[PDB]
């Protein structure tokens, strides 16, 4: 009887075993774009993720993580309100069993079908789990998903969701480029929150871009049919793996453009 996205053991459950899940700086939080301060001393990203080197696939039983090679500064994010380099580990998802939901952040209450997260962790840390020990020792750029035109660099990953359909299954993942799930612009928001899952570590940095990405029906369907449950087990549809928004407290919301 373990977290997750069902009635019994939904977000409304966690804070049982996360006491931290009522903390003061949670993630994710809806961004009013009217009560946000365009903080004009914001460096703008700089995202250089041309050495990157992708490894490995794998469903996890709450989303499917695309892994990558952390070992040196392959593919890093700088600048914005970042200090010190951070290296992308992996990215995921976050997808709704219906196109009107999926998005953990919301804009102005809008939901989007899905939420994209490249997550990183702070170099000067060392490794990850000392880095999630810390205050700014993570560094998630989040991007949102609506349902239109194809997104063609989204493709690769959407044709290997059958070899890793079930939790526990991984399967080599290599030669993959992030550069083709960018928007065009880099305009975002920022403000300090957490993980989105348990242990729900308050040591987020959000870096959350204005501009959505397309990506077709087809594309978003596929992710749906994951499952949450592992080979042999009842088939549970892994949709609505996405936690509802929390209370923004004593936090400002700051973008880079106005
Ligand atoms: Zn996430």
Redesign the pocket.
Same mark, same amino acid.
């Given at each position: 009887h373990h977290w997750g996205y069902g009635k019994h053991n939904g977000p409304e459950h966690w804070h049982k075993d996360f006491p931290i899940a009522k903390g003061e700086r949670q993630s994710p939080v809806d961004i009013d774009t009217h009560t946000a301060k365009y903080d004009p001393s914001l460096k703008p990203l700089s995202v250089s993720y041309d050495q990157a080197t992708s490894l490995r696939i794998l469903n996890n039983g709450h989303?499917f993580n695309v892994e990558f090679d952390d070992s040196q500064d392959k593919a890093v994010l700088k600048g914005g309100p970042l200090d010190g380099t951070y290296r992308l580990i992996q990215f /995921?998802f /976050?997808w709704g069993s219906l196109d009107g939901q999926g998005s *953990?952040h919301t804009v102005d209450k809008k939901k989007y079908a899905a *939420?994209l /997260?490249l997550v990183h962790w702070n170099t000067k840390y060392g490794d990850f789990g000392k880095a999630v020990q810390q205050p700014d020792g993570l560094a998630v750029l989040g991007i949102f998903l609506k349902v239109g035109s194809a997104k063609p660099g989204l493709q690769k990953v959407v044709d290997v969701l059958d070899s890793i359909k079930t939790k526990g299954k991984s399967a080599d993942f290599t030669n993959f480029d992030p550069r083709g799930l960018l928007p065009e612009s880099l305009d975002y928001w920022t403000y300090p929150g957490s993980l @989105? @899952?348990p242990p729900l570590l308050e040591c987020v940095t959000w870096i959350v871009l204005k501009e959505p990405i397309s990506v077709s029906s087809e594309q978003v369907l596929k992710f749906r049919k994951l499952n949450f449950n592992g080979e042999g087990e009842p088939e549970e549809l892994m949709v609505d793996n996405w936690r509802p928004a929390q209370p923004l407290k004593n936090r400002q919301i700051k973008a880079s453009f106005k």
């Open positions: 989303a /995921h /976050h *953990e *939420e /997260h @989105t @899952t």
